[PDB]
Amino acid sequence: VSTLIPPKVVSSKNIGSAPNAKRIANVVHFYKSLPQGPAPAIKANTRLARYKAKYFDGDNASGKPLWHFALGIIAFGYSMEYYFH
């Protein structure tokens, strides 16, 4: 004889179907993350890492590193050809 109780029965009722499914996905995606640009890790110098933080950086990454690599390759090849040819 008791009336229905919508706001009293919300323990099992969630927000539709998709919103409750994505609530767990969105609650923790924003929890454990850097606030703003933390840990840049820019500093690196290990020849390969020296190239990474010197010319191979993605801020520009223009053809200048490629031209420098080609210049070094042809400089080595000149001596190689002198040895061979």
């Binding site: 008791s2 229905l4 109780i5 919508p6 009293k8 029965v9 919300v10 009722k13």
Partner: protein, 89 residues
Amino acid sequence: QDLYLRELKDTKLAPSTLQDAEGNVKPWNPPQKPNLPELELQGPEALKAYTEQNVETAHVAKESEEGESEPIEEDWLVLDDAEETKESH
């Protein structure tokens, strides 16, 4: 005049032994002395409801009932129906 005594004795003799005093009937054969208080005693009784409304039967109707001390069973039934109604909201 003559009528001044004749009609007064007319309306004081026959009505005297017709009603009020309630004894005998001289002017006409049918008597209303045992007709109006005895035969007509059930007159309105016949016209109205007898043994039901004239006696005002003390009909003791059944007292208002309730959920008959229903346990938590109806509580969780209400929970279930509310949940299935609110699931599609």
